């Protein structure tokens, strides 16, 4: 029947209203919030679902409700707390983290969202050296893409916040103290050479100014296990590089530390895209390692499990509510029972199996 179809949608578009009663219900994300809060960071297959269905709907779930609870009760005076979303493949860690990014975005926090951190430790076709420190390298294209997305998300706060120091980009170009933070971002996009340095200034400025009570800051890093792992980038000597040597990885490692206050850090682990990790590794120590685990502790691990019986039925009815499950036997009880066995209640496998059907 369609009894869970009533439970397959909720009218509370605002993430603050959501509570345990709303569990297993899909809340539509406003169109403006997609083109502002989420220009990046949504999984690639989910983005396909948003294009075909014509609407983004994120199931409310207990893991993401627990996280939103901690964020509401945040003690800004105390140091920032790192929340680590760890789970098996396809369980929804990225979309559980995106739910928190929507909650903070609506409360006027400053979103610092790193959609994927593995992209910065592999498949880099331009790797320059850094003037600030010659030992480090600069990834111009990777930094340039992030800045364009960071600008879109935080465009409102780019005029209020103002630099507290002077930054000399070139002999002929420098940033005077007091100028809006938008100038630092604008220079990075205009001059790709400085892009990897504009990012460092942005991270440094926001980290320092957040403690002044001007704004809240959400450091949302998905794929955080990339920072303290290994790379597949080679130097001019054809010798593999280390994560610290990269400028982008070096700056970000500071933001995920609890040495500041005035915001919250939300981290996610992803074996997908990871370098030199097993296919069946999902636990925090397996992916982070000894260096990554020690770097982030004390952190709060939030397990993202597979769909429970209530959530699986809600997900099944959502696909049926959009006419996605076009196979004649899918709507039947034997179809549903079959898909429950093949998918095994895994969110990703259910999406993949239903895509072909």
């Amino acid at each position: 029947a369609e009894r869970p179809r009533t439970v397959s949608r909720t009218s509370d578009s605002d993430p603050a209203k959501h509570g345990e009663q709303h569990e297993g219900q899909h809340y539509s994300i406003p169109l403006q919030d997609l083109k502002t809060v989420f220009p990046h960071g949504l999984p690639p297959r989910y983005m396909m679902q948003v294009k075909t269905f014509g609407e983004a709907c994120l199931m409310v779930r207990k893991p993401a409700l627990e996280l939103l609870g901690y964020l509401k009760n945040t003690n800004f005076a105390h140091p920032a707390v790192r929340y680590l979303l760890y789970g098996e493949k396809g369980t929804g860690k990225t979309l559980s983290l995106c739910h928190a990014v929507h909650f903070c975005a609506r409360h006027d926090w400053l979103i610092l969202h790193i959609p994927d951190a593995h992209l910065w430790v592999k498949n880099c076709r331009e790797l320059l050296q850094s003037t600030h420190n010659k030992q480090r390298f600069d990834q111009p294209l990777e930094a340039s893409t992030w800045l364009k997305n960071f600008k879109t998300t935080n465009e409102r706060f780019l005029s209020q916040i103002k630099v507290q120091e002077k930054y000399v980009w070139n002999k002929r170009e420098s940033t005077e103290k007091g100028s809006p933070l938008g100038e630092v971002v604008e220079q990075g996009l205009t001059r790709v050479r400085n892009a990897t340095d504009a990012v460092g200034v942005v991270l440094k400025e926001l980290k320092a100014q957040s403690a002044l009570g001007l704004f809240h800051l959400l450091v949302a890093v998905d794929g955080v296990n990339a920072l303290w792992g290994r790379t597949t980038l080679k130097k001019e000597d054809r010798t593999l590089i280390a994560p610290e040597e990269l400028s982008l990885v070096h700056n970000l490692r500071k933001m995920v530390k609890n040495d500041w206050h005035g915001g919250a850090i939300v981290l996610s682990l992803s074996q997908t895209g990871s370098l030199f990790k097993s296919r069946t590794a999902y636990l925090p120590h397996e992916l982070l390692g000894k260096e990554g685990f020690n770097a982030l502790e004390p952190f709060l691990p939030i397990l993202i499990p597979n769909y429970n019986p209530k959530e699986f039925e809600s997900s099944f009815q959502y696909y049926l509510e959009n006419n996605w499950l076009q196979h004649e036997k899918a709507s039947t009880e034997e179809g549903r029972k079959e898909l429950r066995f093949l998918s095994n209640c895994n969110p990703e496998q259910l999406e993949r199996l239903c895509a072909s059907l």
Partner: protein, 80 residues
């Protein structure tokens, strides 16, 4: 060094430094006068957190053992 050791020793480790740094920032935000190192690491909250980290490092990491670590963090960080 710490890397050489086969059995984790929380005393004088990266964990103790990271924990002590957090507790020092937590007491400073409270506006209390700077506290002693032994005072911060003698509390029961820190005692339990030591036991959980050691279990993860030596006994083994699993969803059950990670759940115990989650509760210790909540008590240590005064989270609801």
């Amino acid at each position: 060094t710490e890397e050489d050791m086969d059995e984790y020793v929380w005393a004088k480790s990266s964990s103790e430094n990271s924990v002590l740094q957090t507790l020092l920032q937590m007491r400073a935000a409270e506006s209390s006068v700077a506290p002693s190192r032994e005072e911060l690491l003698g509390t029961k909250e820190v005692e339990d957190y030591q036991k959980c980290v050691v279990r993860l490092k030596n006994e083994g990491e699993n969803e059950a053992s990670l759940a115990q670590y989650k509760e210790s963090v909540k008590r240590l960080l005064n989270l609801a």
